[model samples]
Target: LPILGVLGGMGPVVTAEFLKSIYEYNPFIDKEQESPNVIVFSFPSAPDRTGSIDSGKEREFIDFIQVNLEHLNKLADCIVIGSCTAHYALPQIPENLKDKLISLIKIADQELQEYNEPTLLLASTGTYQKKLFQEGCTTADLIISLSESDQKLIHEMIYKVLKRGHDPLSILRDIEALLEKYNTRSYISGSTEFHLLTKSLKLKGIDSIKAIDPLSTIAQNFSQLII
Candidate 1:
């Protein structure tokens, strides 16, 4: 079986959660070894994704990711960076390592093709600035984005609240404000941190709000192919 490489620890908080989700969603009933072979980098020291891109100083960070991916390549047949923003380095990933990388953007594109709805995308300022999700999307679904104020708020929610290990419920007002302000319940939790927010939604049976989450995308959609 092919090994899975997780290039994570952008925040370190949710990397473990994503790993837990992988185990929770794994298909094996009794045979634990049937789960995919896995390795985790949890590399929090990598240069900041936003800091690198905002200043056009992406080479160092890009190279940093490349080196990590190169090492992961030697050990795993497939790799997934557990960050939506870090994907800005995608263009610079070494050719050999590129084939081994499993893309969240491509995965979301496939998913939106089936849903085909104009969903609000909540992400960091860096992701919105790069238009990472929008530029990469080829699906018919219209990707609505957070306003500048809301975008900043979302970034705050991700870094200040979620990454700091605060209760996920603390971000609910803002999350609800986005839904209410937009007059739509469907939204994309483009940053992985919103997985915590959506978990609260699930607990409350807030089914009206549909969250298009990348973590959930991997946890559910890749179960058969991955772990």
Candidate 2:
């Protein structure tokens, strides 16, 4: 069994939600000694990942994840970051440390390879700018994404709306609009916040669309790997 490190804090909300996903989704046996060891470090004040990637301040974001990464590496047998955009700083991690890091985008991208149909991605501006999930896919998974204007709205929903404590339901309109515009029902919750939103939709029984979420995949993977 491996100790899982959650290098979170790109935004505190999704980090918390990811932790909940990991715990709730992972099955339980007896009370003690059966569960996986995980450290969820939600340092919300870390440098703005999207801002840094969009501008010349990339190092600020790298250093932010890296500085805490050292501590995670010390305790975690395997590491998983909560933020997908924060993964853009993946190259900065050392080779030795690389094996311990579970890339969020790559795992989600890998899951979609078997899907014969096109999948839409609803994520942040930086995630689209960096093409994290799209480029990470080994196969041509037909992962369609939002346009520039829709991407801006996606970023807004993640940052200003949900992350800022606004109603997550507000994003449903944009998602529905995109589905109408493209006439597609398959979408991936690329941003972690969108994962939370997807879970909300599921709770509401809104299942008209198919959603591929990395947190769900990672949480299941963790249980499979550990149990």
Candidate 3:
């Protein structure tokens, strides 16, 4: 199997969740050795993604990611960053390293092709400010932006709650409100934390809403790359 390199720890829990999703999608494995090889560099000490971008220290943030990518490139066949917000560093990374990256942005955008209507995008403030998904998506006006107030709410839930390892269930009511407010259940799990909710919602058999989850998409496609 091809080795998969994960440059993660933008939020350590999300990275671990991504790994779980990866293995969950590869259920054919009956033996431990049959699983795909994975190397995760969980660097929690990297600068805060939103803060760095907000402060105009994006160059430093890009450097941080590039340094890690350089190391991961030496050891793995393919590379992925766990955080959607962290993808802001990609454009600045050189082609040699960037080419190996399986971008969450690109993955999420491609997943949107399955939906006919505009889907709400849930991501960090930095991601919205950077227009990462807007320019990244091929279809114009396919992604819906939350209200300024709602963006703050989502950001708080990610940083104050999810990243802290608290139960994400507390935010379900808030998410439900967004679904109702937007008058549609279709959404894009632009942030990795939303991955938790979408996975749980599926397990619980609540299929009213649709989420285009990049991590899940990546996991589903994992087998293709490992060959």
Candidate 4:
């Protein structure tokens, strides 16, 4: 029954998808009024996360995120950021604010611990450059690093295709090929946009690939997280 605050809008669409996932996992299925309480700040005007990291303006980016988290901390019992790339700033934020935060990285890392096979991580270029997943990971030797070219392709699929509202199913074959090349049917979505693709895959019954999504993990554990 606690309030959940969302810091989002690294790109608006993925944040929206995250919100939808929350409701999809809402516990009070029979009563809308009894569903979880949430406050969302979908900030589309926030500067690009990857661009800031790439430019060595990380401090400034962390400052921006800190300001938002501080504000959200005041109003909500718990907070969640919709971005995996933006979580690079988590360590720099104030402890008070960080206490209220439910980290995408930590959630993803925990979810990945259950998988015994190698899982490819799909994320933005900034996330890769910062080694966000690698740094946060406790899943020893389960995540496979992609080739430089493959990372570039996954980055484009997230930013250029999914972020722009283009159908990513067109690139489904390409992703499947990566799965084949890596010899794993599993992938972790380090970028939130890939939630869309994974959802579509489920709906379309494309069961070859298994997605270990932090957003989905958050939704599944929503009741516990806000407490």
TM-score of every candidate relative to the true structure: 0.92, 0.91, 0.95, 0.94
**How many clashing pairs per prediction, in order?**
0, 0, 0, 0
Give the per-residue lDDT digits (tens) of candidate 2, residues 1-227: 67888888767887787777777777677774766678888888888888887677797778877878888878888888888888888887677766678777777777677665687888888888888876787744578878899889778778778787666777788788887886788888778887778778877998887778878778767866532
Quote the lDDT for 205 in model 3: 88
Tens-digit lDDT track of model 4 for 124-217: 7788888988988888378888888888889888877899978868779998999899989899887888878877787799887889887777
> Per-residue lDDT for 53-159 in model 1, tens only?
86766888888888888888888877888888899888866577888788877877777777787888888999899888888999624788788988898888888
Worst 10 residues of 3 by lDDT: 27-36
Model 3 lDDT tens row, 22-74 = 88887764777876688999988989888898776888788889999999999
**Higher-TM-score candidate of 1 and 2:** 1
- Tell me the lDDT of model 2 at 88: 89
How many residue pairs in model 1 have overlapping backbones? 0
Identify the superior model by lDDT, candidate 2 or candidate 3.
3
Each candidate: what lDDT?
A: 0.80, 0.78, 0.84, 0.84
Rank candidates, TM-score, best first: 3, 4, 1, 2
Candidate 2 accuracy as TM-score: 0.91
User: How many pairs in model 3 have backbone atoms within 3 A of each other, for residues 3 or more apart or on separate chains, i.e. clashes?
Assistant: 0
Superposition TM-score, candidate 4 onto the true structure: 0.94
